[PDB]
Design a protein around this ligand. Structure first.
Ligand SMILES: C[As](C)(=O)[O-]
Ligand SMILES: C[As](C)(=O)[O-]
Ligand SMILES: [Zn+2]
Ligand SMILES: [Zn+2]
Ligand SMILES: [Zn+2]
Ligand SMILES: [Zn+2]
Lengths: 329, 329
């Protein structure tokens, strides 16, 4: 499993390089971008903004991003392919389901969901022939019965194809522990799983325990902070009010505890978003003008200043993603 | 002043003919048909089924159907256009929102929803250039805050364009009353509004009181009958336990009250469905083998044999839909 699917086709994992493991071109809903592109100004404006952002990220060293947008997050792979080519940055696309499944998804069995996930990995997404290289799932703190079906379907797709699973958690409710339990009940290896949004909490006991079990730990929202924007309730609700430095110290914390190999770092950024309040993309860009370049431009020097070896940062930003994304049975 | 938009372009009132005013090619979810066409066997198979179904309805006298599938019912106007051309049956497409709006819709303001409905009517659906000729909305009895927004946006779109509004109600909860109040508060003429699924109840005083206020009464679920079987946890809750003759007699009842000009009749049929339990399409087809031809092949002769004159049935199936659909302010 030394080759992975990208929206431009299969690449060898040595080509991935510096990889951001949790990003989005656009945060939306199924069908929404094509039915109402004017919500984003235009489809063209959105594509142009993504190309400019990805190009600047590439200038900073990024060579690959994993777009973890699912069907129900409005994933438009044709858009991902277009901007990947124009920016010349690898984009790995996802299957799976996020927190907004429509009826036609909500009512399906674990067997059906499994077939859908397998379709997008082994056949292609829609009629594009583009194949997902990862499975994205999301749960509330307490996993719902449908969400549990989604996790079991993800595990079975992973076991059949070797592609990894990445999750959305409510880290303040220690959501990963319930996810991990369902995953392991399906015989799935923790090394195939990233428990994401884990920088949303400062509970190191929770993080190290998961890492100790072999789980990848996603510290993937480092630039998200509504500090200075406390009066904006939606900003506080979405990004929290812990500083980005606070988030970044968890990377050091986990290195210091000997878990350098379990860490995955990202921005959780996007170039448009319709799945939150109107104009929110502007609020986010007001806080983090670096966009997806925030990890290489701001976080990497911060960690070096704190004394973390270059070789360590390189293993985290390059080696961990490659071992993670490489289809592994 | 005249033309009605169809998936093949504008048609004149006289071209519409026998019109079924509440139907579906496929009941699904946004993005679903194109992301998982195998759920329906294949897109090709679904299309072939719809064309045969439309051709049979056509041979039974039908010339136009109104597909009231909204964005969130997974309306695929490219499919409607294909099957309309192949069957030579006019199809009117809908805008609006049903009961499963995704997060990118649920967070929107009344102003934004008005823009979306207006773009589907005035500009076109997606990138197809096909314009909606009806606005479809739905409430669940007690109107939720979001649903009230949808209804007001629908009224504002209707008022800007003259295209009519058609609704889904919980008729057993007399839902059409709260809908009418909202519409009227917006300055919408009741003659621009059809209150649908009204045959879901036997409460004629409810129906007559609405008809008296100028509303069109949609008796559009006549074949929906799961009788003889008090043991299906899906078909009984979905289709009810009243005979179709009982539903159809409501047409007679309203005609006798003198309200023939405010009756609209349909099947609420479809050729694929993913927004319920798996294989529910087989259950429906077994219940009503006639599909969309049920109204002309079964209901019309039934009414004729109860004494209803031909010119009255023509008024209902041809004249009432033309007046309803022709954009008017
Ligand atoms: C689509 As998200 C803000 O849960 O990473
Ligand atoms: C798609 As329906 C059963 O609400 O008319
Ligand atoms: Zn997330
Ligand atoms: Zn994300
Ligand atoms: Zn309905
Ligand atoms: Zn319907």
């Amino acid at each position: 499993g030394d080759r992975i699917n990208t929206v431009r086709g299969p690449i060898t994992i040595s080509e991935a390089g510096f990889t951001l493991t949790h990003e989005h071109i656009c945060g939306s809903s199924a069908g929404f971008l094509r039915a109402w592109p004017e919500f984003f100004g235009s489809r063209k404006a959105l594509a142009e903004k993504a190309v400019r952002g990805l190009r600047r990220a590439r200038a900073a060293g990024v060579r690959t991003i994993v777009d973890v947008s699912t069907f129900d997050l409005g994933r438009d792979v044709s858009l991902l392919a277009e901007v990947s080519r124009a920016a010349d940055v690898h984009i790995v696309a996802a299957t799976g389901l996020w927190l907004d499944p429509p009826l036609s998804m909500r009512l399906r069995s674990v067997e059906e969901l499994t077939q859908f996930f397998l379709r997008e990995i082994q056949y292609g997404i829609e009629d594009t022939g583009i194949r997902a290289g990862i499975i994205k799932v999301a749960t509330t703190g307490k996993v719902t019965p449908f969400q549990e079906l989604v996790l079991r379907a993800a595990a079975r797709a992973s076991l059949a194809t070797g592609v990894p699973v990445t999750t959305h958690t409510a880290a303040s409710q220690r959501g990963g522990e319930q996810q991990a339990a369902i995953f392991e009940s399906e015989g799935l290896s923790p090394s195939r799983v990233c428990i994401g949004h884990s920088d949303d909490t400062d509970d190191l006991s929770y993080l190290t325990a998961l890492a100790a079990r072999g789980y990848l730990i996603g510290l993937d929202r480092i630039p998200h902070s509504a500090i200075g924007l406390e009066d904006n309730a939606s900003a506080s609700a979405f990004m929290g009010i812990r500083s980005w430095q606070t988030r970044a110290l968890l990377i050091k914390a986990l290195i210091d505890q000997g878990y350098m190999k379990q860490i995955l770092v990202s921005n959780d950024w996007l170039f448009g978003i319709s799945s939150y309040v109107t104009n929110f993309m502007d609020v986010m860009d007001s806080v983090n003008p670096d966009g997806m370049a925030f990890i290489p431009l701001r976080v990497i020097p911060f960690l070096r200043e704190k004394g973390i070896p270059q070789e360590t940062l390189a293993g985290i930003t390059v080696t961990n993603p490659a071992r993670f994304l490489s289809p592994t049975l």
